[PDB]
Amino acid sequence: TTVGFSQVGSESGWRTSFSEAVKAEAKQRGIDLKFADAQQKQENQIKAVRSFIAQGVDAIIIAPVVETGWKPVLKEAKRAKIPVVIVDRNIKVDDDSLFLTRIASDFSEEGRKIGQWLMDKTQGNCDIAELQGTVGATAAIDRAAGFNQVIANYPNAKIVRSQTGEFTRAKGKEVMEGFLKAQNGQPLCAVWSHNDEMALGAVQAIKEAGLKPGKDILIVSVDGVPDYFKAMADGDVNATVELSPYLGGPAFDAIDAYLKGNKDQAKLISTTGDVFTQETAAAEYEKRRQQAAALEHHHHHH
Ligand SMILES: OC[C@@H]1O[C@@H](O)[C@H](O)[C@H]1O
Numbered sequence: 236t237t238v239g240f241s242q243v244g245s246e247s248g249w250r251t252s253f254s255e256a257v258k259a260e261a262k263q264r265g266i267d268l269k270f271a272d273a274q275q276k277q278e279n280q281i282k283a284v285r286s287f288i289a290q291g292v293d294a295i296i297i298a299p300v301v302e303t304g305w306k307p308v309l310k311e312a313k314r315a316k317i318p319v320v321i322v323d324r325n326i327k328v329d330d331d332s333l334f335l336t337r338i339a340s341d342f343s344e345e346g347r348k349i350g351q352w353l354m355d356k357t358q359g360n361c362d363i364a365e366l367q368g369t370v371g372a373t374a375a376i377d378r379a380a381g382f383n384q385v386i387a388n389y390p391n392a393k394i395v396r397s398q399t400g401e402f403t404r405a406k407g408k409e410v411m412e413g414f415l416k417a418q419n420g421q422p423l424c425a426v427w428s429h430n431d432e433m434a435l436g437a438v439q440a441i442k443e444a445g446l447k448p449g450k451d452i453l454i455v456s457v458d459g460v461p462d463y464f465k466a467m468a469d470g471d472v473n474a475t476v477e478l479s480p481y482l483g484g485p486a487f488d489a490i491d492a493y494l495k496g497n498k499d500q501a502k503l504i505s506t507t508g509d510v511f512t513q514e515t516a517a518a519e520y521e522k523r524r525q526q527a528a529a530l531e532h533h534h535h536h537h
Pocket residue numbers: 246247248249250323324374402429430431432457458478
């Protein structure tokens with residue numbers, strides 16, 4: 236089987252771990268993976284997908300950067316009789332026959348679990364700064380929606396500052412610096428970061444402001460990357476929800492079934508991770524530091 240995979244980019248360590256996981260799962264399954272990196276631009280994804288259709292691949296997997304603008308290319312794939320699996324983020328389309336299925340976590344559930352954890356931690360008394368993900372990304376929209384739905388139940392919890400950090404470490408840091416300046420000395424209880432990458436940038440801004448991240452300002456997030464588990468083990472951040480980078484597997488199963496002639500296929504197959512905190516961070520970082528450092532030995536190329 237030849238399968239084209241259109242990846243978003245490399246904005247976070249989570250994302251690059253996802254790319255490495257898909258490549259590793261393809262290899263396990265003897266699949267010829269045409270991997271494309273779009274460098275954060277939807278237009279590059281559309282181009283990759285077009286090329287996959289021109290090359291006559293057996294299936295296409297798309298991790299869509301934003302939700303809009305996919306219908307024309309999906310219709311092209313359909314006319315070409317090439318099944319499409321969506322992974323990670325979502326697309327907004329009016330006809331679900333334009334894809335085979337979607338393999339994803341429940342981002343609203345991720346936002347709900349981390350929000351609940353924070354309310355429990357702070358007994359519902361918490362001024363929060365939000366570092367948002369990229370505009371139009373399902374992961375940002377839905378994590379915000381879920382967190383917001385939990386904190387609406389708690390009158391003494393409120394989001395006092397909210398701005399995009401673009402899912403990146405450098406922009407998370409810059410934004411967090413800005414927040415700390417705008418607070419004008421008023422304590423923040425917590426930072427809610429849509430991903431661990433921005434959260435780790437926030438940690439450095441907090442330190443530079445002479446405050447103790449993980450103690451004075453709580454830091455809660457999503458992804459469960461090893462560097463964040465390390466930070467939790469060190470006391471600098473508090474909690475994250477794990478986001479499995481192994482979505483390729485169920486994507487390849489769905490493709491394998493479709494090619495073998497299976498007709499009955501659900502349109503969404505989903506499982507969501509658990510909240511991890513400092514309580515198990517020493518134990519968990521140990522397990523994760525090698526499932527990690529496999530990737531650190533990989534070879535550099537574009
Ligand atoms: O779509 C998943 C999100 O995108 C990545 O940028 C984040 O790290 C991850 O939570």
